[PDB]
Design a protein around this ligand. Structure first.
Ligand SMILES: [Zn+2]
Lengths: 137, 298, 189
């Protein structure tokens, strides 16, 4: 709205941080509004880490809006990316686990639960005693 | 080399198609060689539907007097036996299947049509004869196959038949024994009329080298399924039904002795054995198992 | 090496012998067509309930070759997906098959193309001219781990119990054990 014009890496970073903050105070009514305006400028970016921090923050907008099954698809995706540092792929995979478990009993969820026992990386997670016992009924 | 038959000579087919030894002699084709895959899928198609008759299409070739069947598949049609030529519903899935199948390997042409007959032998009904006559009329080299899945089980061996119909005008020669199978009276009439209008084909079963070698390697772990077979609750609703058939056949011959088709106790006696012979054979494999697995002590 | 080797589990698999024979017919026929051994490829179908998986029937798929990479022509799969949903309306898409050695890179590239279609694609591989005195048919699945800072696909091998259907069992007992003039006096027993 301002007179001046700004770049992609500033606007996509600003709406990233705005949406991330309204969630931290528990208010997804506000956080959903600015991440929607962030999606306009994420296709336009050539930044290989800023698009990654959008999908980490878009997975959380579906998490705090209780779309747990679709949130698991975002989180699971990010743990498989090598560009993301190894200690940050552990959190990426574990947030998928929580949102795979707490979702409603979908058939899509049964295939996620299968991917979660198939992946040895999940064995390291603390809710494996739940998952092991969940997937195998 | 056993794989003499899994070969497919296409130019030889179209020379025979033009030559035609079937328009010269009415009963030319007498034998029928059924492949390894063809047998399994046809048996599987019949039982899969089960109680209901469902027909598919067969693919194959000709050789001498033998009408060889190579590969088979299903036709998603309904009203088999109740409609004359029930394959008309899915004229799409005949040519469309062979057009897809020829891209992947199945070069074989239309050789016939097969249907299931659950719990009442292998034969052509009055509805089946009208289908096959007109099949032979236009779409030549076409053979009508039949399988009885429910009895294949209880009898304990492949219950199957392959037939061809005669012309409406010329009538068959004499040489014909034709073996007896229990025909339920509800159907005996329909069979009885149109039964002499056709002739069967001498069935034979073959296999490839790989098929033969695979089945031998397969048998290492398939003996387990033989001794946990139990043909009792599997086909429970054939044997329990055959009783209902048997009861009627006696009911007739009882009154036949009285006041009032020639001695229908001789049939019923053979049916009472037929059906019970199975029931006993069942309890052979059961006691065989009780002997084996239960009686070891700790 | 490009297979898994780890503490597996996951699903439990069954296997109908009709599937083995439909591949066997498909190998011998395509082998015969070209006068050489052929790596034939096709699709798997059957019942899927909960974890457990049964493979009932199987058919063929169209394939091409971009450079050295085996391209499953998907436009053919979707066409046959029509026709197999017609006849066996109950059945589901499960996986795919091929012939040759054990699992290798050329099938991992194909496994990616089946992974676009479904989220849990099984994989059978058969050795036609096998040296094994045992059966050369082993079942596998897609598993992915960290290969030294690299998330990448692997094959976790699984076992297979054989199918039981009484009507089918006779089909096996007939061709694997043929009455080629071996019963004169009925006997029955
Ligand atoms: Zn019929």
């Amino acid at each position: 709205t301002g007179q001046k014009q700004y770049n992609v890496d500033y606007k996509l970073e600003t709406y990233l941080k705005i949406a991330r903050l309204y969630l931290e105070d528990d208010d997804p009514v506000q956080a959903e509004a600015y991440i929607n305006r962030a999606s306009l400028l994420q296709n336009e970016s050539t930044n290989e880490q800023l698009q990654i921090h959008y999908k980490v923050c878009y997975a959380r907008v579906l998490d705090y809006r209780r779309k747990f099954i679709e949130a698991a698809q975002r989180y699971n995706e990010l743990s498989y990316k090598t560009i993301v540092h190894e200690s940050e792929r552990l959190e990426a995979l574990k947030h998928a686990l929580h949102c795979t478990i707490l979702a409603s009993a979908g058939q899509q969820r049964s295939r996620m639960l299968a991917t979660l026992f198939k992946d040895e990386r999940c064995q390291q997670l603390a809710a494996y005693g739940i998952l092991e016992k969940m997937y195998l009924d | 080399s056993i794989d003499e038959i899994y070969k497919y000579d296409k130019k030889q087919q179209q020379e025979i198609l033009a030559a035609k030894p079937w328009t010269k002699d009415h009963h030319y084709f007498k034998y029928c060689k059924i492949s390894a895959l063809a047998l399994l899928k046809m048996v599987m198609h019949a039982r899969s539907g089960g109680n209901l008759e469902v027909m598919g299409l067969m693919l194959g070739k000709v050789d001498g007097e033998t009408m060889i069947i190579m590969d088979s598949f299903a036709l998603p049609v309904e009203g088999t036996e109740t409609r004359v030529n029930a394959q008309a519903a899915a004229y799409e899935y005949m040519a469309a299947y062979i057009e897809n199948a020829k891209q992947v390997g199945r070069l074989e042409n239309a050789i016939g049509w097969y249907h299931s007959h659950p719990g009442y032998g292998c034969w052509l009904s009055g509805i089946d004869v009208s289908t096959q006559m007109l099949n032979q009329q236009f779409q030549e080299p076409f053979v009508a196959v039949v399988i009885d899945p429910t009895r294949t089980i209880s009898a304990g061996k492949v219950n199957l038949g392959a037939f061809r119909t005669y012309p409406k005008g010329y009538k068959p020669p004499d040489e014909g024994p034709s073996e007896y199978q229990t025909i339920p009276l509800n159907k005996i009439e329909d069979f009885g009329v149109h039964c002499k209008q056709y002739y069967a084909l001498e069935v034979s079963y073959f296999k490839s080298s790989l098929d033969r070698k695979l089945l031998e390697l397969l048998w290492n772990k398939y003996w387990v399924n033989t001794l946990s077979s139990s043909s009792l609750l599997t086909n429970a609703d054939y044997t329990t039904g055959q009783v209902f058939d048997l009861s009627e056949k006696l009911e007739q011959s009882e009154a036949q002795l009285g006041r009032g088709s020639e001695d229908k106790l001789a049939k019923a006696t053979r049916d009472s054995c037929k059906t019970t012979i199975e029931a006993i054979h069942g309890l052979m494999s059961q006691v065989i198992k009780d002997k084996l697995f239960n009686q070891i002590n700790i | 090496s490009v297979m898994a080797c780890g503490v597996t589990g996951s699903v439990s698999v069954a296997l109908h012998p009709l599937v083995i024979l439909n591949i066997s017919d498909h190998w011998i026929r395509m082998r015969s067509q070209e006068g050489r051994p052929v790596q034939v490829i096709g699709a798997l179908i059957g019942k899927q309930e909960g974890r457990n998986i049964e493979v009932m029937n199987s058919f063929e798929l169209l394939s091409h070759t971009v450079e050295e990479k085996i391209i499953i022509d998907k436009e053919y799969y979707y066409t046959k997906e029509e026709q197999f949903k017609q006849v066996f309306k109950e059945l589901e898409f499960l996986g795919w098959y091929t012939t040759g050695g054990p699992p290798d890179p050329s099938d991992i590239h194909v496994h990616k193309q089946v992974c676009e279609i479904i989220e849990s694609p099984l994989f059978l591989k058969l050795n036609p001219m096998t040296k094994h005195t045992d059966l050369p048919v082993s079942v596998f699945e897609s598993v992915i781990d960290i290969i030294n800072g690299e998330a990448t696909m692997l094959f976790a091998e699984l076992t297979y119990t054989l199918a039981t259907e009484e009507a089918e069992r006779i089909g096996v007992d007939h061709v694997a054990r043929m009455t080629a003039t071996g019963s004169g006096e009925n006997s029955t027993v």
